RNA sequence: GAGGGAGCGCCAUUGCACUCCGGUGCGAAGAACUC
């Protein structure tokens, strides 16, 4: 896929509290650049993936090329660029990718 | 003086900031008169708490008044400071709001009980 | 230092809560095995930094060496091994007293 | 403003704990946050 500013992450674990869940994307994302929001799936039940929306398409790599397959929560993140405008559905529809 | 429609004696006032002081660790009480005005018209409050000495007399003002039209208790504190710290905040507190009866309700029944009969 | 089941993290950004920052060490740190606990405390005397308890010593070292310089919050940890035991460690051998 | 309900700054601190504990301005007379 062409870059993108925002990076969709899934196979994130999906038993977390959701809240603990955009914090800790952002104690990991935040060395990338500024985030202008964290846009997690809910939940529980299906599976788990997240948008984080960063401000500037560079950092949106920089993630992309290095936290790729870290195991976040012992589950190694797949991390893509979002497709077009895939995020600001995600967070219409209500209910939260 | 005199948004104060009734006076009650030092050590009636003392059980209960000290009682509220209790409840939150029970039940649950919403400090400040915001959320006590809206604890009120919610529907919700079984006893409310206003501070005798709160400045702009205008801010507890219509707590009286809207705790006697669908009839909640009442009782008055000297300093706000004291319910302040009775609520267990950091800043002075002008009226606060029991909304649950965790499990102190006879205790608190006795008190209203004693707001009755003045 | 000998290694030691518990590692000692330090420069950790200090502008952050307690159960933030305990529950975004174990989001990072969960992946190398199991943890006992996590310890912070933010008395001036224990700003910034934080003990992580793993169960086997060979999870502590893992961690270590992968997490070394890590920007968790935009800031590169620091991680050593404790110093000395941790109590429940000291039960667990108990050594504790 | 409507919601909301307790934090938000500054100075100092690089500090090895497992009884808790720096200073200080603002904050229930409403912090953060959402609209």
């Known amino acids: 896929t062409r870059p993108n500013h925002t990076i969709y992450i899934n196979n994130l674990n999906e038993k977390i509290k959701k809240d603990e869940l955009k914090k800790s994307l952002h104690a990991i994302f935040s060395r990338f650049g500024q985030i202008l929001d964290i846009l997690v799936s809910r939940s529980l039940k299906m599976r788990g993936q997240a948008f984080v929306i960063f401000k500037e398409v560079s950092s949106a790599t920089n993630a992309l090329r290095s936290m790729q397959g870290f195991p976040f929560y012992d589950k190694p993140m797949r991390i893509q660029y979002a497709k077009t405008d895939s995020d600001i559905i995600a967070k219409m529809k209500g209910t939260f990718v | ?118």
């Open chain 2, 1 to 118: 003086a005199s948004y104060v429609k009734f006076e009650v004696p030092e050590d009636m006032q003392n059980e209960a900031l000290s009682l509220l002081e209790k409840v939150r660790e029970s039940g649950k009480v919403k400090k400040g008169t915001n959320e006590t005005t809206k604890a009120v018209e919610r529907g919700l409050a079984k006893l409310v708490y206003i501070a005798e000495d709160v400045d702009p007399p205008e801010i507890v003002a219509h707590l009286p008044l809207l705790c006697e039209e669908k009839n909640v208790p009442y009782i008055y504190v000297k300093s706000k400071n004291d319910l302040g710290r009775a609520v267990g905040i950091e800043v002075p507190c002008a009226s606060a709001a029991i909304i649950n009866e965790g499990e102190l309700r006879k205790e608190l029944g006795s008190l209203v009980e004693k707001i009755k009969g003045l």
